[PDB]
């Protein structure tokens, strides 16, 4: 009996490597070359991999997992019993695959056009507008235009997507798709734990929000910013107001401590997308971690194609399930923001390489947030003024309190501002999946949460037909989002532990773990576990303790919280948005 279970997982592993490797190649080809042909082939591979999943998932369900003794085999079989979309009847499965393909293609090819003028894509064109324009009406054009063209066009698909993804989840023993997604963390207390973490970061976020709101009031005018209300959502330098670092120039704490233009520095010094990924590779290997294989450099897509091909530009990392072939797909732009993204994606590749010898059912991160956090941890060190100066992208900014607070502010605009956004995305989707939000109030409930958690308001009142969640990649692409909230909490925990491992002393935000073999060994031992053990074990290997905790992030930003409280108190800011019902008059 035990022996039948072992043979089963051995046969599952052999056949899954072959089938998954073939699917990965067809998915890569559509993603790097959106055409009618590659679409058709992808859909055919969907059915071939569904046939495999159904064959083996049906066998796995014949095992009473309770009677199995070996915990690793127990764990693999339990996972294989979840067929995901392959549980759907053939008709519904075909419909679901086409729905996902149609949503992804619609988002990827959407454009915003001036009347008898240029037509702009999201990347790079509209993202550049949101990042650099300081004109209220030009920002509004790009903000509304993207939602009009991308979001509104996804709405026709979303109710059917929800019905089918929930149907699949119920057929695999869950109550709805959000239940299925949350179960990937294997943490019954997940919702309460995340809410406790969110509340711990409220002092920092509320003080940052009030400080930024005052600076926007200075620039965009008292008639357009309510100092006791929510912030208009198009003024934060980013299409989704999920990171605010592009308005640093408007909110710099000490303008007498100017910082070099890092984009112009990268461009003036002939940086390229390949250089950016090569620097990321060197950081990983300085820790004693693994280099990406030569094949990686020949097969990856590290910039947008010149030949006009439609592609999925959103950055992503690809495991082809043969232990040899790993790739990144990114429409890379030469700036600091994309340098961080490059490290993010290279962290995925490192995880792939570290757990490549596990059975494929266990070739995942300890939980989804762990997978998203690895590259971000290294990027925290890359972003320090000391490291950027070593790359000739900043002048020597050391030993200045003013430069110190300026750097903490730059980091806060990315890391702290993202916390409430990363929280609310799946608060919304979980309630869509469980039926608390219907298609009659998709958009109203999205903005209720944008207000409640981020303190933002739409610059233009929304109307029937709007589907603003559809204008955010992960919604039409059906990529879970709470992983990024988890990642942003634990990456600071990891940073703090690795800095301690490296012998660093003094303020956590001054730590640079470059070349620390001790830091590397912490990360490798945990990554090698893949998904073979509950994630608290990986947390323990890295940090010396088993819990998710906001204390490290709070420690990192403590000098900024002190400065923000003093600054906001001096100006008499009312934290939060008591006038929560305010929206722009013009």
Ligand X SMILES: *[C@@H]1O[C@H](CO[C@@H]2O[C@@H](C)[C@@H](O)[C@@H](O)[C@@H]2O)[C@@H](O[C@@H]2O[C@H](CO)[C@@H](O[C@@H]3O[C@H](CO[C@H]4O[C@H](CO)[C@@H](O)[C@H](O)[C@@H]4O)[C@@H](O)[C@H](O[C@H]4O[C@H](CO)[C@@H](O)[C@H](O)[C@@H]4O)[C@@H]3O)[C@H](O)[C@H]2NC(C)=O)[C@H](O)[C@H]1NC(C)=O
Ligand Y SMILES: *[C@@H]1O[C@H](CO)[C@@H](O)[C@H](O)[C@H]1NC(C)=O
Ligand Z SMILES: O=C(NCC(=O)N1[C@@H](c2cccc(O)c2)CC[C@H]1C(=O)O)[C@@H](S)Cc1ccc(O)cc1
Catalytic: 345? yes
Question: Which residues, at least 6 apart from 470, have a Cβ–Cβ distance to it below 8 Å?
Answer: 107, 150, 151, 152, 153, 154, 155, 158, 476
* Catalytic member of 310, 474, 518, 567: 474
Q: What string marks each residue from 37 to 76 as x (binds ligand X by CB under 6 A) or -?
A: ---------------------------------x-xx---
358 near ligand X, judged by CB under 6 A: yes
In the block, tokens 């450099």 appear at 297
Nearer to ligand Y, 33 or 59 (CB): 33
- Residue 77: CB minimum distance to ligand X, A: 10
Tell which residue, 533, 544, 527, has the closest CA to residue 375.
Answer: 527
Residue 344 in the binding site for ligand Z (CB under 6 A): yes
The answer to whether the beta carbons of residues 151 and 239 sit under 8 Å apart is no
Tell me which of 123, 345, 364, 397 is the catalytic residue: 345
- Residue 575 Cα distances to 205, 210, 435, 489, 566, angstroms: 10, 6, 33, 23, 13
Q: How far is CA 344 from CA 272, 280, 532, in A?
A: 17, 9, 23
Query: Which residues ranging from 369 to 408 are in contact with ligand Z (CB under 6 A)?
Result: 372, 376, 379
When asked if residue 360 is in the footprint of ligand Z (CB under 6 A), the reply is no
Q: Does 37 bind ligand Y (CB under 6 A)?
A: yes
Q: How far is the CB of 347 from ligand Z (least distance, A)?
A: 9
**CA separation for the pair 367, 533 (Å, rounded):** 10
* 147 marked as binding residue: yes
Site string for Zn ion, 351-380 (x = CB under 5 A): ---------------------x--------
Number of residues binding to Zn ion, judged by CB under 5 A: 1
Location of structure tokens 């933002």:
456
**Which contiguous run of DSSP H or E holds residue 329?**
strand 326-329
Tell me the residue ranges of DSSP E strands in 330-483. 456-457
The C-alpha atoms of residue 58 and residue 81 are separated, in whole angstroms, by: 7
CA–CA gap between residue 468 and residue 445 (Å, rounded) = 11
Query: Which helix H or strand E contains 433, and what residues bound it?
Result: helix 401-433
Annotated binding-site residue? 191: no
Determine phi and psi for 378, rounding to 5 degrees: -65, -35
Instruction: Take residue 388 and report the two structure tokens written for it.
Output: 């950027």
372 binds, among Cl ion, Zn ion, ligand Y, none (CB under 5 to 8 A by kind): Zn ion
Rounded Cα distance, 73 and 8, in Å: 9
Instruction: Answer yes or no whether residue 33 interacts with ligand Y by CB under 6 A.
Output: yes
Choose the stretch contacting ligand X; rule: CB under 6 A; options: 146-154, 174-182, 206-214, 352-360. 352-360
**Residue nearer to ligand Y on the CB measure, 328 or 413:** 328
Cα gap 514→496, rounded to integer Å: 14
- Residue 37 interacts, among Cl ion, ligand Y, Zn ion, none and using kind-specific CB cut-offs from 5 to 8 Å, with ligand Y
Give the tokens for residue 319.
Answer: 């495991």
**234 flagged as catalytic:** no
Minimum separation from the CB atom of position 526 to ligand X (A): 15
Binding site for ligand Z (CB under 6 A): 314-317, 340-341, 344, 348, 372, 376, 379, 477, 479, 484
Which residues of the chain form contacts with ligand X (CB under 6 A)? 6, 9-10, 70, 72-73, 357-359, 532
Contacts to Zn ion by CB under 5 A: 372
**List of residues contacting ligand Y (CB under 6 A):** 33, 35, 37-38, 309
Binding site for chloride: residue ranges?
147, 185, 446, 450, 483
């Amino acid at each position: 009996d035990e022996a039948e279970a072992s043979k089963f997982v051995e046969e599952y592993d052999r056949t899954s490597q072959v089938v998954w490797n073939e699917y990965a190649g067809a998915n890569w080809n559509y993603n790097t070359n959106i055409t009618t042909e590659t679409s058709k082939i992808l859909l055919q591979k969907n059915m071939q991999i569904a046939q495999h999943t159904l064959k083996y998932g049906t066998q796995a369900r014949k095992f009473d997992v309770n009677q199995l003794q070996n915990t690793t085999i127990k764990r693999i079989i339990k996972k294989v019993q979840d067929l995901e979309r392959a549980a759907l009847p053939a008709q519904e499965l075909e419909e679901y695959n086409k729905i996902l393909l149609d949503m992804e293609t619609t988002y990827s090819v959407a454009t915003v056009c001036h009347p008898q003028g240029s037509c702009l894509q999201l990347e790079p064109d509209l993202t550049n507008v949101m990042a650099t324009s300081r004109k209220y009406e030009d920002l509004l054009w790009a903000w509304e235009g993207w939602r009009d063209k991308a979001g509104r066009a996804i709405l026709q698909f979303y109710p059917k997507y929800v019905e089918l993804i929930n149907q699949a989840a119920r057929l695999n023993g869950y109550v709805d798709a959000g239940d299925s997604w949350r179960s990937m963390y294997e943490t019954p207390s997940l919702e309460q734990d995340l809410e406790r973490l969110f509340q711990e970061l409220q002092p920092l976020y509320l003080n940052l929000h009030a400080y930024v709101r005052r600076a926007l009031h200075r620039h965009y005018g008292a008639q357009h910013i309510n100092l006791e209300g929510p912030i208009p959502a198009h003024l934060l330098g980013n299409m989704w107001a999920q990171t605010w670092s592009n308005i640093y120039d408007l909110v710099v704490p000490f303008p007498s401590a100017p910082s070099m233009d890092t984009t112009e520095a990268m461009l003036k010094q002939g940086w390229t997308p390949r250089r950016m990924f090569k620097e990321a590779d060197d950081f990983f290997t300085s820790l004693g971690l693994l280099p990406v294989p030569p094949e990686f450099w020949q097969k990856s897509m590290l910039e947008k194609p010149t030949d006009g091909r439609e592609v999925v530009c959103h950055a992503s990392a690809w495991d082809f399930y043969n232990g040899k072939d790993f790739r990144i797909k990114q429409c890379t732009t030469v700036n600091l923001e994309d340098l961080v993204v490059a490290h993010h994606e290279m962290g995925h590749i490192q995880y792939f390489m570290q757990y490549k010898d596990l059975p494929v059912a266990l070739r995942e991160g300890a939980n989804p947030g762990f997978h998203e956090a690895i590259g971000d941890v290294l990027a925290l060190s890359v972003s320090t003024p000391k490291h950027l100066h070593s790359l000739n992208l900043l002048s020597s900014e050391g030993g200045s309190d003013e430069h110190d607070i300026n750097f903490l502010m730059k980091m806060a605009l990315d890391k702290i501002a993202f916390i409430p956004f990363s929280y609310l995305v799946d608060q919304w989707r979980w309630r869509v999946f469980d039926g608390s939000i219907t298609k009659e109030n998709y958009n109203q409930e999205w903005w209720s949460l944008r207000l409640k958690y981020q303190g933002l308001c739409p610059p233009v009142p929304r109307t029937q037909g709007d589907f603003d969640p559809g204008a955010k990649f992960h919604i039409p692409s059906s990529v879970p989002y709470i992983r990024y909230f988890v990642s942003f909490i634990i990456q600071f925990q990891f940073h703090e532990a690795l800095c301690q491992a490296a012998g660093h002393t003094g303020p956590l935000h001054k730590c640079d773990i470059y070349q620390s073999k001790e830091a590397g060994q912490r990360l490798a031992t945990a990554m090698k576990l893949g998904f073979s053990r509950p994630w608290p074990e990986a947390m323990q290997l890295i940090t010396g303790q088993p819990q998710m905790s906001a204390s490290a992030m709070l420690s990192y930003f403590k000098p900024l919280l002190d400065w923000l409280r003093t600054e906001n108190e001096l100006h008499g800011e009312k934290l939060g948005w008591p006038q929560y019902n305010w929206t722009p008059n013009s």
